[PDB]
Structure formats: C-alpha cells, structure tokens
Design a protein around this ligand. Sequence first.
Ligand SMILES: [Mg+2]
Ligand SMILES: [Mg+2]
Ligand SMILES: [Mg+2]
Ligand SMILES: [Mg+2]
Ligand SMILES: [Mg+2]
Ligand SMILES: [Mg+2]
Ligand SMILES: [Mg+2]
Ligand SMILES: [Mg+2]
Ligand SMILES: [Mg+2]
Ligand SMILES: [Mg+2]
Ligand SMILES: [Mg+2]
Ligand SMILES: [Mg+2]
Ligand SMILES: [Mg+2]
Ligand SMILES: [Mg+2]
Ligand SMILES: [Mg+2]
Ligand SMILES: [Mg+2]
Ligand SMILES: [Mg+2]
Ligand SMILES: [Mg+2]
Ligand SMILES: [Mg+2]
Ligand SMILES: [Mg+2]
Ligand SMILES: [Mg+2]
Ligand SMILES: [Mg+2]
Ligand SMILES: [Mg+2]
Ligand SMILES: [Mg+2]
Ligand SMILES: [Mg+2]
Ligand SMILES: [Mg+2]
Ligand SMILES: [Mg+2]
Ligand SMILES: [Mg+2]
Ligand SMILES: [Mg+2]
Ligand SMILES: [Mg+2]
Ligand SMILES: [Mg+2]
Ligand SMILES: [Mg+2]
Ligand SMILES: [Mg+2]
Ligand SMILES: [Mg+2]
Ligand SMILES: [Mg+2]
Ligand SMILES: [Mg+2]
Ligand SMILES: [Mg+2]
Ligand SMILES: [Mg+2]
Lengths: 204, 159, 137
Amino acid sequence: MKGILGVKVGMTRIFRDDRAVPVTVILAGPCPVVQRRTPEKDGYTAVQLGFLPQNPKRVNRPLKGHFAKAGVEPVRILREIRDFNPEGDTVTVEIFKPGERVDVTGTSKGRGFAGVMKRWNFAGGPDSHGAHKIHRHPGSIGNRKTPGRVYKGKKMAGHYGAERVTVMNLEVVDVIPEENLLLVKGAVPGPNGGLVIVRETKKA
Amino acid sequence: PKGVSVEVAPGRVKVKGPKGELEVPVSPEMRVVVEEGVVRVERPSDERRHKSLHGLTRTLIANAVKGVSEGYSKELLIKGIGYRARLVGRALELTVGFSHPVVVEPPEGITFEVPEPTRVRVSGIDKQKVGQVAANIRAIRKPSAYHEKGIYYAGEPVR
Amino acid sequence: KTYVPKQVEPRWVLIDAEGKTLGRLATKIATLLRGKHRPDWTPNVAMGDFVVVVNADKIRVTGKKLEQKIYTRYSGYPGGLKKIPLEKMLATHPERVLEHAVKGMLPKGPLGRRLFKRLKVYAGPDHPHQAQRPEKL
RNA sequence: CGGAAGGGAUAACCGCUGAAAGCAUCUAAGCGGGAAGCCCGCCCCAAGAUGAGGCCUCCCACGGCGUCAAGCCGGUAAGGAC
RNA sequence: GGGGAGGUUUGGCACCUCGAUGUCGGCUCGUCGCAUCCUGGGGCUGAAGAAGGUCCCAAGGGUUGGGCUGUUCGCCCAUUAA
RNA sequence: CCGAGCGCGGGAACAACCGAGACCGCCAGCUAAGGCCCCCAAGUCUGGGCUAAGUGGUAAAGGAUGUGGCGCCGCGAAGACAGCCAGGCUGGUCGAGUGGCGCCGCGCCGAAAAUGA
Ligand SMILES: [Mg+2]
Ligand SMILES: [Mg+2]
Ligand SMILES: [Mg+2]
Ligand SMILES: [Mg+2]
Ligand SMILES: [Mg+2]
Ligand SMILES: [Mg+2]
Ligand SMILES: [Mg+2]
Ligand SMILES: [Mg+2]
Ligand SMILES: [Mg+2]
Ligand SMILES: [Mg+2]
Ligand SMILES: [Mg+2]
Ligand SMILES: [Mg+2]
Ligand SMILES: [Mg+2]
Ligand SMILES: [Mg+2]
Ligand SMILES: [Mg+2]
Ligand SMILES: [Mg+2]
Ligand SMILES: [Mg+2]
Ligand SMILES: [Mg+2]
Ligand SMILES: [Mg+2]
Ligand SMILES: [Mg+2]
Ligand SMILES: [Mg+2]
Ligand SMILES: [Mg+2]
Ligand SMILES: [Mg+2]
Ligand SMILES: [Mg+2]
Ligand SMILES: [Mg+2]
Ligand SMILES: [Mg+2]
Ligand SMILES: [Mg+2]
Ligand SMILES: [Mg+2]
Ligand SMILES: [Mg+2]
Ligand SMILES: [Mg+2]
Ligand SMILES: [Mg+2]
Ligand SMILES: [Mg+2]
Ligand SMILES: [Mg+2]
Ligand SMILES: [Mg+2]
Ligand SMILES: [Mg+2]
Ligand SMILES: [Mg+2]
Ligand SMILES: [Mg+2]
Ligand SMILES: [Mg+2]
C-alpha cells in the first residue's frame, strides 16, 4: 500500500516514444517514518512519514519528544499513510516504478465565496431579453406550501475550493531517483508548493 | 440400512461407511432409532407439520446411508457437433459452442469422470451435492430446443 | 405529606440475553431503569438501577422478524430513507437491537435519556467487571 | 482522471435434495445460482458520536482563607494569545 | 357483461381563504412517484438466428438539437441507447 | 348532542362517537367508558380453542391441494387410490385407507403514488 508525501512542484510536458505527455512533477523527499501504528497499540495499521526539514529551534514543542522518541531529525509535516508498513527508516520515490498508477491527494485552489454559477456550473439567467438583475442567479430554490422548506444539500453559492481533493489513477512516468522527482499525468490538485500525497490506485 | 455405521445425536446424525462420513442434520423433535442393523424414526404426534417433518427425515437418512453405500453419481450427455469435454487432472474443461473453454474445478467430496468426450459421470457420497454439481454442469449450456445440442442428462430431448 | 427519598447509591444488575424474546426482555430492563420496582418510587428523580446486559447477540425473536422486520433511520436529506432489516443489525453492531428497544420503552424527557445512560449493553459477556453485577432473570 | 473491479445479501426467475400426499413439487426442514438495483467497496465530511473515542509525546503538587466537601485569589509550566 | 385501484382530465359540492392564497407558457433550480422510454435481470412466444411481440423484476443513472405556434400539447426536420 | 358543555374521562391527537351534566375545597374512597407488557395508572391474571399472515395493523368481484372443524356421495381387506411388471380396463405385486362434493372458523392472493417511515 505504498505512499509518500510530496509537493506539487510544477508541470510541463515531455516526449515519450513519439508523442507529447502532459506531466506534473512532484518532489517527494525521503520521508522518515516517525511512528508506526499496529493493530495492537493503535487498533489499525499505518505509518507516519515526516516531510520537510525543520529548524530544531521552532520545534521547541513537546514535538521534540516524538522525533527524539524515534531519533528523527525533526520534519515539518507528517501524515499517516494508512495500511502500509515499510522498513528501513525512510520511504522514497523508489516505491514507484514508471508505469505504476497512483492516486495523488491535494488541496484544491481556494476560490472563496463562490457564485452558484462557478460552484455548480449552474445556468443562471439570460444576458438579454428578460430581467437584468438575475443574470447570475440560481433562480428558484423550492416549491410551495409543500414541502415548504428547502432540501439540505441544495446547491447554493459560497466558500468553495481549497479542500481535500483526491484525483485517482494517474500514470507515473520516469521517476528521477536522483533529484527526488516523481513524474505524473498532470492532473494533480492544489497550487505549486503544496503538500500532496501519492499512493497505489484501485485498478484491480 | 445394513453393513453400515449409523450413530445418533441430539439434532444431527453421523452416518459412516466405506465411502465416507456424513453429518446429516435432522429435526430434533423427531426420534431416530437404531433397531438391529436398521434404523427407525418415530413421530411425537400427528400434527400436519410433524408428518411433513417425518418423511423428510426418513429419506434424508436413507440417502446418507446409501450415500456411504454404493455412493452416488450422475450422467451427462454432450450432444451437438463441436461440443465435447476433456477431463483434466481433477477439474473438467469442456468446449461447448462458447469462444472460451469452461474449466470447472470440483467441489470437495465430489469427483467426476469423462468416459468419453461425449459423456460425463459425476460421483460423490452426497445426493444433494451430486445433484447440484450435476445441474451445475448442465447449466454451462442447457439443451437448445431447436436442435439437439449441449448437455443433457439421460432424459427426453425437448424437441 | 408523602415520603420523599434522599440521595442513594445506585444498585447495579447483570442480565443474560441468550434465549430472551427481545421485547419481553426490554420491558423488564426498562422497568428496572426507572426506579420502579423500588417502593419509594419518585418520578422526577432518576434512581434507577444500572442494568448491564450481556450476550445480546443471542436475543431470541419470534416470527420471521429477522428477515421481515426493518429499522428506519431517516438521515436529513432527499431520499435519506435508510431501511435496515433486523438481521443486518445483529450481523453488524447488534447491541443496538436491544438498545434500540429500551430507548423505546423509556419515557421521552431529559430524564428518559438520563436513564438510557444507566443501561449498558454488550454482546459478550465480558462487560467491564467493576463491583456490583448481581445477576438477575 | 472518474462511472469500476470486487465481496456480500437479494428481486423476478432457474434450480439441488424432500416430505406432507408410496408418485409428483424449488419448500413446508435444508441448499446453490441470479439484477445498471440493496449492503459493502472508491471519493468527501465527520468525536457537539454530550455515547464528546484512540495514539504518540511534553508540562506537573499548595503559596494564603473554607474544620471533612465544592471552591476562592495569585505568580507560574508545557504551551497559547496579542 | 362484471369488480376495482389511482386522484394526472372534465366535472359535482361550496369546507378554509374576498381587511387579497398574483393567473397560462417559458426560463432557472429541481426533487419525488413507477403505472419503466433507455440501459441491467428474467418468463412465455405463433422464439432458427438477427429483429421483434407480451408479461415479470428493477429507479441506479440517462432521457438530444432545431422548424411552426404565447402555446401546453401536437405536427414536422436531423439524430438517439432512449 | 355541539351550538351555549373547544369544561372533565375514553377514542394517539379531533365541536357534536363512547362515558359524564364541572358551586368551592381535600396528598380520602366506589365506579363509568376504556383499559391492566414498557412509554402509561392497573393481570406479562386462569381456563378452552382458532391464526402464522404482522393477519391483527382495518379494500372488491373473483382465484387457490392454507389451516382447522363438521356433513354427505363413490371404489376398498372379495385387496382399493399411488407408483412400479405385462396387455389392451385385465392381471399381479404392495397392503391400508382413498377420491369428490358440500358448510363453518381463522387466514392467503387479488393490492401501484408521488418530502421519511
Ligand atoms: Mg509553525
Ligand atoms: Mg448565460
Ligand atoms: Mg423588466
Ligand atoms: Mg426590480
Ligand atoms: Mg412541511
Ligand atoms: Mg419420490
Ligand atoms: Mg423431483
Ligand atoms: Mg446524538
Ligand atoms: Mg514545580
Ligand atoms: Mg517541586
Ligand atoms: Mg517566563
Ligand atoms: Mg515559555
Ligand atoms: Mg499565533
Ligand atoms: Mg384545462
Ligand atoms: Mg350548505
Ligand atoms: Mg391579514
Ligand atoms: Mg399577503
Ligand atoms: Mg401574496
Ligand atoms: Mg388565477
Ligand atoms: Mg423478452
Ligand atoms: Mg428472442
Ligand atoms: Mg432472438
Ligand atoms: Mg415487484
Ligand atoms: Mg414494477
Ligand atoms: Mg429516486
Ligand atoms: Mg426519473
Ligand atoms: Mg442523484
Ligand atoms: Mg419556438
Ligand atoms: Mg394544439
Ligand atoms: Mg345541551
Ligand atoms: Mg404499570
Ligand atoms: Mg398469560
Ligand atoms: Mg402464564
Ligand atoms: Mg393453525
Ligand atoms: Mg365463484
Ligand atoms: Mg374472497
Ligand atoms: Mg383452499
Ligand atoms: Mg350445505
């Protein structure tokens, strides 16, 4: 159940055999496993990789007593990658062979208070003939005396984006073990410089 | 019910013979007995449901007996041109009009023979189980009704 | 002027569910929950025993229930219907079938719910042994 | 990039064995197959789940009134806020 | 000839509303029902196959763009799995 | 009867259905309708049956080897019905009941609707 943390670094395309390939580049620095979660102590199994190199200064926390309790140069972030227990002390791009399909998780760019038109690809009014103050409005939201209420979940405008977005099943292209790069099929959430986590898919 | 090894119990009955060993879940409120080299089953009343339950056990048993006696088996014809079947190890492959030969691995307690590519005998200690796998085979290609083709038993052709 | 209880220590109990008709069982568990077998009963107060049940998963139930009986659970939304048949219940978390039926014979207020909290259910046994436990029937 | 796969339980329906009712029957005891649907599985939210869960880790006694009891006032710890 | 279900039509009644419950069609946003148009599963067929017919099961999702009319509806054009 | 008893009890809730005509007070008693497993006061009361549909938890013409109870007609130990062997009812073998009608009780199907049951 491989997995590694990374940062959307950027993307460009590259040429394979004889066709262009849109790739996004994740840098997936050597993640120091920092705790492991057993079926006995924790009740479920997984593994806590750290990520960015941290100033032993800003780690003044009780956090020291964690890194210390596993002798790991203090990282910046650390998330668990459920149901996957490795070896050594660190996970690296090497879990990924080119052609393996991965699911990358990310955090969608944040659009703030979003129009129903942008948030739901709603139709909205007519630029022309009729009224002019409902141009981008959702229009009707209900019925009459029955129900005589709005349904929960009704699509309405408001803070949208900047949320946990997993885009399943992209193809790993050439992984640069050297500079710690991981090449993929482009479609990966959040802005450049964002934390992301890559994993094995569900194809079969 | 002779030459055998019938052994009562609360809700079930152990039936042993050369062939094998069968656990035969019987009603608890029935009374299976063991007269001589044979077996009885007597009923606690004459209520509609005790009768139903009665015969059903008095057969469910007999079957378990003969089941470790001569044992059980069924016969499968495989008519129609192309249609045939090679036995392979334990499980039997069989090509039958499909674009894919069907490999049918054998349930435990079962074993089937292919005397001829056109015939298939299913042997096992257990009626119910035999009967199933039997039909379970006929199923791969039920008998057409516009021409003799596919698996039959040894009963009329639908015509 | 009618007697009125002062504070008291809560009696506990232990029950074995195996073989019990689920409802017939709930009824009692209920009547225990309200301090209602005690003769110094007081409505407004909640001096009920602390009924503890075990071997829930084994609860007998008459007729076709298991298959036939459906548990409605209305989420907030369009088509939040959610019908759950009696079996799926026991098959996954089964304590509920019992819980989901004492809550039912308990009255409705804040007290009712104070009470539902006294009742403690496991399919087991192996309840957190602690002290009291005077088995019943 | 996605709709799946897959596991499980079922619908009509197809059956294995079998009485009642010597036969016959899918059923009444029992069992197998069987849906884009049900439950799972994937994605997201989520412990105000007041039934407030778990793990790892860091800080740690009293300095004065209330006679047992709940507290009250202060400078602090980790740590947090401005 | 007979018995029903539904409460989408046309009505009957005149029960709330005449110190006001804005009307048809469209748009926008839908969500439910199933008596299912498609897709899935099936029975019979006067089912060779292919295509169909009739009935059963199944709401999960889907259910196009134009011409004419304020139209709903309907006709028509070009498609469609529908 | 409500109106004027939208005062009280029952009926989930509900002017007129069931009970009953509220002068005031009571931390007394009997009852009424309706009830006595829990929410909910009082029987998990006693005895005899019926029903396996959640019927009860409230739909028809019509349909059906549901189930139990009763009544009548037909063949049967001179061998019947059921199958199994032979022939086109006959025979045997088996060996005790079998076929049809009719009436009552409870039930089954007929039974599709729109916010969550
Ligand atoms: Mg920081
Ligand atoms: Mg526009
Ligand atoms: Mg205007
Ligand atoms: Mg205006
Ligand atoms: Mg409303
Ligand atoms: Mg037979
Ligand atoms: Mg048969
Ligand atoms: Mg809650
Ligand atoms: Mg100190
Ligand atoms: Mg000190
Ligand atoms: Mg300081
Ligand atoms: Mg400090
Ligand atoms: Mg800060
Ligand atoms: Mg009109
Ligand atoms: Mg009038
Ligand atoms: Mg007004
Ligand atoms: Mg107004
Ligand atoms: Mg108005
Ligand atoms: Mg109008
Ligand atoms: Mg068809
Ligand atoms: Mg056809
Ligand atoms: Mg065809
Ligand atoms: Mg249906
Ligand atoms: Mg239907
Ligand atoms: Mg729906
Ligand atoms: Mg629809
Ligand atoms: Mg939807
Ligand atoms: Mg037009
Ligand atoms: Mg017209
Ligand atoms: Mg009067
Ligand atoms: Mg009581
Ligand atoms: Mg009794
Ligand atoms: Mg009794
Ligand atoms: Mg009965
Ligand atoms: Mg008639
Ligand atoms: Mg009738
Ligand atoms: Mg009948
Ligand atoms: Mg008569």
